[PDB]
Amino acid sequence: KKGSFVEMVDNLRGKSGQGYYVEMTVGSPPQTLNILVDTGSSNFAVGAAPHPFLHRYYQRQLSSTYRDLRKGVYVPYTQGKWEGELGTDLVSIPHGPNVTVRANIAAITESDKFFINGSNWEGILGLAYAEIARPDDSLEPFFDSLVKQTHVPNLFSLQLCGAGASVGGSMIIGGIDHSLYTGSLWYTPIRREWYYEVIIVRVEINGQDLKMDCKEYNYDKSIVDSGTTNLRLPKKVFEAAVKSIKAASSTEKFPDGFWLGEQLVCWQAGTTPWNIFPVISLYLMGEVTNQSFRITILPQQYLRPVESQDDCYKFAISQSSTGTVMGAVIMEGFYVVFDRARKRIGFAVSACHVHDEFRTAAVEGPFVTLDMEDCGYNI
Numbered sequence: 067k068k069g070s071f072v073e074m075v076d077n078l079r080g081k082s083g084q085g086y087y088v089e090m091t092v093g094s095p096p097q098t099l100n101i102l103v104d105t106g107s108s109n110f111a112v113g114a115a116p117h118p119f120l121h122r123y124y125q126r127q128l129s130s131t132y133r134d135l136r137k138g139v140y141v142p143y144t145q146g147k148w149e150g151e152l153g154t155d156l157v158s159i160p161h162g163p164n165v166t167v168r169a170n171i172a173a174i175t176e177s178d179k180f181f182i183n184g185s186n187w188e189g190i191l192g193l194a195y196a197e198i199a200r201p202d203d204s205l206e207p208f209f210d211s212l213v214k215q216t217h218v219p220n221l222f223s224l225q226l227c228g229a230g231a232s233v234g235g236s237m238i239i240g241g242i243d244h245s246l247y248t249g250s251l252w253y254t255p256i257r258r259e260w261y262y263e264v265i266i267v268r269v270e271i272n273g274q275d276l277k278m279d280c281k282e283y284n285y286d287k288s289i290v291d292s293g294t295t296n297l298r299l300p301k302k303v304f305e306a307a308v309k310s311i312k313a314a315s316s317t318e319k320f321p322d323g324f325w326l327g328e329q330l331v332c333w334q335a336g337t338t339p340w341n342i343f344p345v346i347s348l349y350l351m352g353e354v355t356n357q358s359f360r361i362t363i364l365p366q367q368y369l370r371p372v373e374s375q376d377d378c379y380k381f382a383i384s385q386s387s388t389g390t391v392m393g394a395v396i397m398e399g400f401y402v403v404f405d406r407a408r409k410r411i412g413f414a415v416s417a418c419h420v421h422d423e424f425r426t427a428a429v430e431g432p433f434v435t436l437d438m439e440d441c442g443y444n445i
């Protein structure tokens with residue numbers, strides 16, 4: 067089994083807070099496009115018309131291999147949204163498996179709050195399941211095609227490395243690269259195949275139990291969403307967390323705006339009080355009954371840095387009313403294996419992740435935890 071995917075390493079790029087994107091080509095002859103990696107969607111879409119924030123776009127009238135499904139679609143994201151027209155064509159990935167598949171594509175015609183000014187990416191690649199792909203579960207997701215058409219194993223992995231400018235990372239399609247991680251890879255079930263829904267069964271700031279019915283952690287749902295930057299937590303759990311964390315940082319106090327993400331804090335050139343902020347652990351239902359493991363992050367993960375002679379940061383842990391959302395603040399610390407074949411997800415320490423001389427992210431296990439499946443939300 068190949069364990070060194072030389073071609074696919076460092077294949078991802080990103081501009082902090084604006085996401086990680088890969089290079090892809092569509093139409094024939096090929097037209098290059100910087101697509102954005104998003105494990106929290108299922109529509110493959112691209113800028114298909116001129117627009118001020120787009121440096122370039124896909125022109126269906128220049129691809130001989132083009133083809134039009136004669137149907138329109140649009141998708142509402144948390145804040146922005148786009149309206150496109152569906153079709154097909156040949157898609158490739160210059161730094162991915164040397165295959166060339168036919169996928170579905172929404173040519174984006176009209177968009178509001180979707181493209182970001184100078185974000186350098188022109189489209190999105192929803193890597194999630196068909197269950198939530200507009201117009202409906204019929205529009206076969208791109209990764210599903212890449213799979214049925216070629217021989218790339220049904221599974222991909224992601225290494226997102228933040229920074230302390232220009233974030234990088236690896237997207238290994240169809241395999242796991244042994245060099246991207248250290249130690250042991252722990253898996254957690256994928257509750258339901260719509261989003262990448264997992265389950266948290268215990269949370270703790272600086273090793274101290276938050277102590278809530280593990281149902282509040284998954285109130286609505288919990289998902290791994292690379293397409294989201296912040297660690298989003300339910301209403302109740304968010305407050306609990308900020309109080310605890312707040313307690314642990316008390317050496318210095320910060321304006322209510324900070325903990326609400328409205329304001330950003332700074333310190334003299336590289337004199338960040340890293341060691342006052344606590345570590346955060348999420349316990350995820352393990353594979354073996356009554357057995358679970360935990361992933362712990364650092365301030366270097368949840369205090370996303372922001373562009374004088376100071377180092378300013380934005381608190382990256384925020385509230386949510388749509389379940390828990392393990393975004394980038396989480397992921398940027400691990401090597402996450404989205405093993406679709408076996409309905410699961412692995413977590414191992416990320417070999418490129420930012421951490422200081424004294425503390426490092428981690429993944430440890432096992433822990434004999436009882437009544438875990440009850441931590442899940444039923445409706």
Ligand SMILES: CN(C)c1cccc(CNC[C@@H](O)[C@H](Cc2ccccc2)NC(=O)[C@]2(Cc3ccccc3)CN(Cc3ccccc3)C(=O)N2)c1
Pocket residue numbers: 083084085086104106107141142143144145146180182198291293294295296393
């Ligand atoms: C379609 N569907 C089933 C669905 C509907 C609603 C919610 C979700 C959950 N998935 C969300 C991600 O798929 C989606 C990916 C995206 C990125 C950039 C622009 C537009 C969309 N993220 C957000 O909407 C934002 C929503 C958001 C906007 C502003 C403040 C907080 C959150 C974008 N923002 C920052 C970001 C910008 C650029 C690149 C990467 C991340 C986030 O962290 N999340 C899925």
